[PDB]
Amino acid sequence: QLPADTKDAKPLLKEMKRGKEFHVIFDCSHEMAAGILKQALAMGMMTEYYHYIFTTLDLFALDVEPYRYSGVNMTGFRILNTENTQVSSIIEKWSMERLQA
Amino acid sequence: QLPADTKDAKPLLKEMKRGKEFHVIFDCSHEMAAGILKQALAMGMMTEYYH
Known part of the structure; x- marks a missing residue:
């Protein structure tokens, strides 16, 4: 289990690396994926050995x-249908109004 | 030989990784050491393997 704070990620990854877990499944809002990947890098783990999956x-x-x-x-897994032309068009249009945030 | 600027450095590190050269000596004013090490990181070329 990921501990409460994101930046506490260190021991867990450290244990995983020591135990030689060469596969992982995640499950978390990608907002957590950012923190966990930055740790997974700075802990020197992104090597073609490990092979993540994301749900x-x-x-x-x-x-x-x-x-x-x-x-x-x-x-990973994506459903928003970027393949279709109109879908992409609407994505872009919404994007041009999305950036006010 | 490192190329003119830092960008040429990545093709080299690619060769080092491919041939599996698990040791290195460098030589540069450390200002070059910084960029070459950054590349060393993002290339998946910085682990407990190499030294």
Whole structure:
């Protein structure tokens, strides 16, 4: 279990690394995925050995960049149908009004 | 040999990782050490393996 605070992530990952858990499933609002991935990097773990999975349906929303050359796979799950033209159009339109926040 | 700027450095680290060169000596004014180590990190080239 992830402890209460996000930045307490350290021991848990540390135990996982010591125990040599070479697969992981997550389950949490991607907002938690950000914290857990930053730890998973700074703890020197993003290596093509480990191979995460996410059930949070918003991985597409992360910043995949600083991790992408490392060679981990995070198979995930997305439903918002980016494939269709009109869907993407409406995404963009809503985006042009989304950024007022 | 490291290239002119830092961006050329990544193709090199790629070779080091591919051939599995598990040790290194560097040489640079540390100002180069910083960028080369950052690349060393984001390349998945910074673990308990290498030294």
